[PDB]
């Protein structure tokens, strides 16, 4: 059985528009793990974007996407989504789905959050085609 | 844009010949590396990132021991010995940041083997 975290829904869109990404796990479980979306803008480093808890469904966001992105899951138990509204050119990036292993000390002050498996990612381009300097971002 | 500053800093690039040793460091602050656990990732060209080290110095099952990590103060380091051409990739350390409340990734280090 092949092990896969497949993302899709990436595409070219105009600023202000919206898109929905989906991440489908195959050959791996989400049981006892959290899940996050991480993106990588053109030629830049990895940036955490959003996460959801497989335990209670709690949702979390970086300040730069709050109020605009919505992470959710459905009853399949192996699928999550990232609704992206009011898109901005700086939202341009490859979006990775990544399974998170989360631990903390008993006082919830020291944390260990790492990603033990990632998908190939889906590309999201937000632009009008007009940028003033090379590609969008 | 152009040049900039990162919450957790890494050299932009590292290089060495096949067989040599290479070290990549991440320098952060008290709220990220200082108090939380660091992980390291290998992002092969056009490839899904993969976990190399977790909780400062642990290696996941399929990762050879020539890859090792350590943490000291607000700094973390990834050691790679016996360098191989297949090791060419971008490397990132990662850690929770208790102030920004996000998992912050280092700026990234491009490893060239030559």
């Amino acid at each position: 059985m092949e092990v896969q975290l497949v993302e899709s829904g990436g595409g070219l869109v105009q600023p202000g528009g919206s898109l929905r990404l989906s991440c489908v796990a195959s050959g791996l479980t989400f049981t006892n793990f959290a899940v996050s979306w991480v993106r990588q803008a053109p030629g830049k480093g990895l940036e955490w974007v959003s996460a959801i808890s497989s335990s209670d469904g709690s949702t979390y966001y970086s300040d730069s996407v709050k109020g605009r992105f919505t992470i959710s899951r459905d009853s399949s138990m192996n699928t999550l989504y990232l609704q992206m509204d009011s898109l901005r050119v700086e939202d341009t990036a490859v979006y990775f789905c990544a399974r998170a292993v989360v631990s903390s000390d008993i006082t919830y002050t020291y944390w260990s959050k790492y990603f033990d498996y990632w998908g190939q990612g889906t590309l999201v381009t937000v632009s009008s085609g007009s940028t003033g300097g090379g590609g969008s971002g | 844009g152009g040049g900039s500053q990162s919450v957790v800093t890494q050299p932009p690039s590292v290089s060495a010949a096949p067989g040599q040793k290479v070290t990549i460091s991440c320098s952060g602050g008290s709220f990220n590396i200082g108090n939380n656990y660091v992980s390291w990732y290998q992002q092969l060209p056009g490839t899904a990132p993969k976990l190399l080290i977790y909780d400062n110095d642990n290696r996941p099952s399929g990762i050879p021991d020539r890859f090792s990590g350590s943490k000291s103060g607000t700094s973390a380091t990834l050691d790679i010995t016996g360098l191989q051409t297949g090791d060419e990739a971008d490397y990132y350390c990662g850690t929770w940041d208790s102030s920004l409340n996000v998992v912050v990734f280092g700026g990234g280090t491009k490893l060239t083997v030559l």
Binding site: S58, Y60, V102, Y108 | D55
Partner: peptide, 13 residues
């Protein structure tokens, strides 16, 4: 260890 796996919770506070 000092760490305790949250079993799927991204955060606790």
């Amino acid at each position: 260890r000092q760490l305790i796996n949250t079993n799927g919770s991204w955060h606790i506070n």
